[model samples]
Target: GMTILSDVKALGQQIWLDNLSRSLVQSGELAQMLKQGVCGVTSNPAIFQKAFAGDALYADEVAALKRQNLSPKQRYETMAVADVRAACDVCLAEHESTGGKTGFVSLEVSPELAKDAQGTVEEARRLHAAIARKNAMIKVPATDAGIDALETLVSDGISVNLTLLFSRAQTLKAYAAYARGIAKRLAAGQSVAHIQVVASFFISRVDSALDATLPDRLKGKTAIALAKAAYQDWEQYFTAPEFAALEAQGANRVQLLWASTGVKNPAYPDTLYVDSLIGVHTVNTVPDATLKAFIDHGTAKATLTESADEARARLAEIAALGIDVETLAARLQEDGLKQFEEAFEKLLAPLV
Candidate 1:
């Protein structure tokens, strides 16, 4: 019935439904997707704000909570938690069946918590614990502070999805944090088997933000270049003696998850990300159209090269073309915070 997603699964990839709501779960959309090879779900504040505000589907629940005199935050929690629990129920069997390897839905705490290291940790624990399912993960931003918060959460045995990373530098920081947290857990005699993470690296937005500044040779190239460097970093991070030491201590490497996989440049192939970054042990979360587009005419090949030549050459080219990859990395993240917060402000505005 869902055309684009079915083909995505056929291509040996998991089509994680990006949007989730009470209706999606209650009406069996979430469960239906599960059987259709939809292994996961992700929710952001913006998604919920709209789901909570615009959809009459949630109106009754909101009204009932309001009649109970619940605070706006409480009402928001009521709707979000209910849907999260329902979605978790849909994916629970897979979670157990995979022994924690796959099948998880991620719910992010406030984007407001992005810069607050201690507060993010507390909220991460509070949110992850509230889900009442082993498979739920709390997503954190990839800021410098987010690095420490991620480690703290994982050390407490919580799962994480690190978001908003735009460059290899941020990716490297997240990997180190994951490894350190798992190592801490093992040293304290904690079980390390079920802990999970996805080091989310953003795609199209990098190119979109940097393209115009560079000449034609570097245009439409930022996304692939960013992904290539991250891929190389993932390859090197896991095998290093430092990582080996952590692995020996029951620490596992987080899978490199590709986030923001949509193309901002209309001139580029619609399935640019899907076709280009098809190497092993990575997860690419694309929008619905891109997922379907890949299913329809997309090709997949091993694009993660063994040597660092591609990453190095392309990065040098981008830099020489007058593009500031690292600066864009930082700028994109700051702007991303504003974007989410603005969305949240709008999302929560109706209730206010």
Candidate 2:
């Protein structure tokens, strides 16, 4: 049973499932995946949209909810909350075994609240309460408003998954928010040991957006370079004097979780993202196909720290070409929010 996925875990990186569904959990498939070293699950609007449309296990509940007087969003949450809770239960043992460091199932707030800091906070509270599982994490976007919500939520001792981060700037903002939240909790004499958070930095989308504009030499390399640079930031910050004091107070370091890792281009290696970004205290959440491909042929090694200086140089080279990766990061975050909004709208359309 010494598979590549387990090897990745042994090397200190976690492989989280990027896709979730009723069948995946209820059919015992998710449990089987846990045996293979998948330690967590992450869901978004598009993921839930796909799950609701394709899973027959949800039909009975969907039918019953349709006859109820609730709004479409409520109907959607009713189903989503149940699936998330089930996943939390399935992963609970791993959760307990790891002292709540792993086995988290992320449930994202409505994409419509991406810009409403107050609204995002309110909805995150409601979703976290509804899920009612210690292993459940409410996901918030890395938008300006979402960062505000993240600080408030973390201060309240709620676990969070900061999603849709595309640049080191966004990732650093998330880290600052988490640290501030922990500091706030410590000031209030609250325990900071139990709260958990992960900043989900998207991977393949970076290449999908920029590859067409680059020469073949640098086409598929930007995202990994970005991640490597960010990982270095993670190391420097968490080990710094300020965060070291927070760590003494039992604050957990915000980990980087790689998202959108499935290869979008046919010319690239299928396991490019997974193979290139393995390191301690990091995570790669891969879709089912990518997971299967990695299991079949992926090599697990500590590649994340391999080219620290080169990673910075690659990013600088991209910027020197007038590519403006920062602007592209902003655009990608906006486009990503819109895509989720569209998926959410379509997801709710049928419930009525």
Candidate 3:
């Protein structure tokens, strides 16, 4: 834990574990990770699905909550919220010390509302307020409708982690919505100080998508290409003269977060995502496996920002190869939402 988190901190980035379970939190290992330098924790339906299936840590809590006559969703949230709150307290000092930049733990709405804008905004607010901690964040997909919910929720003073973005269009749209939300907060004279938004674009999924259809030259390039291209645009869009005008009024930049970093292709390096993407004002939530690999043999370099121009050029070239990024983005969100909903449903199946 110290090796991975400390290496990331040395690169001037944050190390947020991408997986959490009631077992980890209740066993107190999460607190050890925090003490060893983990800055944040994140959860999803699938992560909890595996944890709930594999560990009996929540059995007593489930039975107790059932005794209270809580609904299935209520029971699930009861479990998730408690884990998130535990991590929040462990990092409470960091949350307080950094003015809320560190010590963040994210929880998702009923992956059931992953695509419903109005519904998503309502769930986002409900989950965040229910958790009721300054360091809590809500995860929303980067579908167009989710963008709408994201903009509305962040504008209302909640932090957001935009999930499942595949291409440049989705990434930029997520960033744009975040910008709008921050701008809205500023206009209302609300304090935008503690509110942070991250475009949690998926990394390795792109390579998996294109590896078979494209030539060997393009097989392993998708994730880095997408990320580098988005960062170039991020540098341009966030640093816009107009945005500068807004920043002077107290708006913060929505940092780009690289998620799903471990390479799926067997031929690719295990550290493919980590070694290729590195920069400030950006973060990569390393999976536990990826984190360990990097600490053992992964080299850190300034790979993220340095490839900006090439990223833009390569992305344009890929589009010329007939990948309809816009259509793919919509399909991905549909799949993401369904996957989450299924996982959540299965997770709550045994509650009674």
Question: What's the count of clashing pairs in each model shown?
Answer: 0, 0, 1
Query: Considering only N, C-alpha and C atoms within 3 Å, which residue pairs clash in candidate 3?
Result: 278-304
* Cα shift from native, residue 13, model 1 (Å): 5.5
TM-score, prediction 3? 0.94
Off by over 4 Å in 3: 1-4
Worst 10 residues of 1 by lDDT: 4-13
Best by lDDT: 2
Better candidate by lDDT, 1 or 2: 2
Query: What TM-scores do the predictions have?
Result: 0.92, 0.98, 0.94
lDDT of 3 at 328: 70
lDDT of 1 at 124: 87
lDDT for each of the candidates? 0.78, 0.92, 0.80
Q: Is candidate 1 or candidate 3 better by TM-score?
A: 3
- Give the runs in model 1 whose Cα sits over 4 Å from its true position: 1-14, 306-308
Q: Is candidate 1 or candidate 3 better by lDDT?
A: 3
Model 2 local distance difference test score: 0.92
